[PDB]
Design a protein around this nucleic acid. Sequence first.
RNA 1: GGGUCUACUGAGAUCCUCUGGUAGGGGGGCGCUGUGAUGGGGUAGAAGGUGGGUCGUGAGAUCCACUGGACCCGUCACA
RNA 2: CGCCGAAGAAGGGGGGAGUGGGUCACUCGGCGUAAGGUUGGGUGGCAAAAGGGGAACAACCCAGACCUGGGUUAAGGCCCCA
RNA 3: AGCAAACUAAGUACCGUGAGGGAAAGCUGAAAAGAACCCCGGAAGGGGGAGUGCAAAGAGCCUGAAACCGGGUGGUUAUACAGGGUGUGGCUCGAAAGAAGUGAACCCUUCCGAAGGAAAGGGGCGCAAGCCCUUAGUACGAGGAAGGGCGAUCGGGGUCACG
Lengths: 140, 70, 123, 150, 123
Amino acid sequence: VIVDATNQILGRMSTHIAKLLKSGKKVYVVNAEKAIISGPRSRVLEGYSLLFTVKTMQNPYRQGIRRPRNPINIVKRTVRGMLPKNKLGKQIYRNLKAYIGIPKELEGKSMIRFDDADVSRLKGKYITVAELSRLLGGLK
Amino acid sequence: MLKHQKYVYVDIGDQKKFLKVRFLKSRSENNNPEAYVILDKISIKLPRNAKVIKYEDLPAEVKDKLKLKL
Amino acid sequence: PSYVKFEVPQELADKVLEAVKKAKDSGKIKKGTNETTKAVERSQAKLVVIAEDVQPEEIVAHLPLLCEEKKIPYVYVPSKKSLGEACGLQVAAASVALMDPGEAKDLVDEIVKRVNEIKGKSS
Amino acid sequence: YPILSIPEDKLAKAVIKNIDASVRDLYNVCKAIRGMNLKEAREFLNNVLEEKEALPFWRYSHGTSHRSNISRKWKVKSGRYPKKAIKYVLKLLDNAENNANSKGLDIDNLKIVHIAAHKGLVLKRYMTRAFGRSTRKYKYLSHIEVILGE
Amino acid sequence: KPAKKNMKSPGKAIKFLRFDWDKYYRIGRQERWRKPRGIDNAIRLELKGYQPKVKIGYRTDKQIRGLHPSGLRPILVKSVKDLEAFAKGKQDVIIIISSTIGLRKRIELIKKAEELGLKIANR
RNA sequence: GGGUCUACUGAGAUCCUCUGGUAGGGGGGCGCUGUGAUGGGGUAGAAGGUGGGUCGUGAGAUCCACUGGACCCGUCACA
RNA sequence: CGCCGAAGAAGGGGGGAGUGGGUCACUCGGCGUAAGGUUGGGUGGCAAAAGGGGAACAACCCAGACCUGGGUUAAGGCCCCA
RNA sequence: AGCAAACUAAGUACCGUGAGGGAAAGCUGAAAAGAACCCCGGAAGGGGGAGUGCAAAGAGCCUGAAACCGGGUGGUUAUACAGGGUGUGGCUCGAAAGAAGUGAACCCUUCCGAAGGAAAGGGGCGCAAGCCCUUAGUACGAGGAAGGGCGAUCGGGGUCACG
């Protein structure tokens, strides 16, 4: 089960992920950097910048620690912080994977979109995900 | 209570089930049937201070009423 | 002894039990009247043991005639409790039939023939 | 006298009474050699007698710290030398084979199948702290039983 | 008869142990029930999910109230004489031979029942 | 709770209805130990303990295996 | 008018009590600017009132728990947590 | 507990310069028959083995609970909670004492049916979101009845997973 988030609203796209999570089926996301958040540049950064403690970064993505700044970090906290707090909530969180671009071995499989998350549903003044890490600290 | 040896347990196949009756130290014989009154109490485990008897030890006359329960 | 038709001596009825004991180990035996009766209708039975102490009796009383009409041997046995334990059961069993003696070939047969003379003089 | 599984005529039982050995430290002893053969066990203790290697603790670890003499028994890193304790254990197992020799067995092929650790008997004395007070200075005894067999 | 089990199995009874039996052993071995007469106490306030305070409403049906689990009526015996006063007959009651009667008295005592067709549990 | 039947004094049938809970009042029930009795009974196979079935809303009752090794309950009334 | 009443009864007598530090919400006062302050009138809980919502909650709203089960509903809510 | 006092001495040991205050502590079985004798240690009524005796829980001696600790049985742990009841399970114990072969557990099939309560289709209306009559109090249904087929475990105890 694979979903594309290109030109999708992260908060909106987040939702139907969760029901698929609560379903009990393993999922994936590709090209996640291609989602967007409504809002002008100042706020959307400011509405995220407030959480900073320190700056640096010294591993491959795999940690999942108290402050996200990689492109596929931000998706996780937005999908994690929207999951049951009971024990299965942790366990269901184990079945999710994040990606930038397209993993090679998943190209030849179907993908689906969430129409409710289409950019067209929004007036405008949005920013792509990948743009964030440029300001958020992601060298990528 | 078994230490009085006023009871005797029966060994059948030495498996995980045991049978018990009341023995009579009187009657002075090995072939005496009346010194043995058959009951119906199969027991899971052999009791600690129990006194054990082998099925073949019984007088042949009394094997009849017993082997059926085996 | 309502459904009972002819008397069998103890020295004979008891001799069935060890065969029944020799039946359960390496043969097929049905326990349960609704099962054992079906053996007659399925004609899968060969030997039948009946306890002459049930209460009430009509649950077993109809077997002797229905088994007879298919010409299958059967016998009366003293105690269901004795039979029930002979079925490896902690509780008595009323009706039990023989599906196959297995290793009990040589002793089931003479029991069948040596009970007929009692029934032969019993009409 | 707990396990009665293997036929008795192949078992050796010997017990000891009210001996000064802090059961707090004895706990290692029963888990030390449980199931190991006597031979290597005897010198294993001797090895610890002259500190070739220490002996593991498992939880009563306060006071005793890491050596660099411990990896046989895996996760253990707490080593202390219980000579006053272990001396009895050697002394105890000595009384064992006498029984084994009594009944015609094979000394080398024997098995430590049960070793018993138990509270001993209590002796009552009173210490004397300051300020005209009194406290508790009981001397803790011990009982250790062992079961040997082939 | 078929309406015997159809309330006990669904109406699963509750052990009804003392309030706060779990925490302190000084209650568990007591293994009984008491009415908490407190103020800050919980079950007296009926807070959810706390093995709710006993009340009269959890009775068993009067048609079987206190029936023997086999459906008959449980009445005990202590000696030979009590047997003759068996009520009505063997059809509605079961007997518990004394927990303390001696065997040298039991052997004759037990025989008195089945000859009268009674039902005996502690055989 | 209130409106029909049997019983040397509690037991049944039917109808209506009422249903949170401290201070407090009232109704009824089990247990402990002794006394009188008591169709009565129970005991070298009791008591008790351990664990576990079954009854009872519960209060508790009651039972099975073992351990024990010499005395112990049911009913009524009474203290 | 309406309701309770001889199934379950206006008045009279009698046995036994605890209760005399309340608080808060709303509403109309006084004192004081004020106060989860104090001090009054009326109502309501709570005290001694579980159950659902308000995030958790004595008092805010819904609503008075003989028990089990089924169903429909209230105050509230209906993207996910749920 | 019974007066403090049932015991090898009780107003005794003892605390106090003093008038004074003031303890604790029963049970070997009937008969010591107190384990002769053989091995370890030096010894220990200590070990082991044998023996007495109904029984040795045989000197620390009737019976022998918990708090405790140790060995084992059964589950079970290093991504993670206090606990309990609760649903689903997994694995385990199940001799009797509970059901049960005179039928448990499990499948079907037929029937009755509380309140309550549908949908597709049809037609109409409303921008829409839907409603209106019909399909229909029908299918459905909490509960209860019959039959069949299957054939022996269930109920129950312990732990753990997650809700």
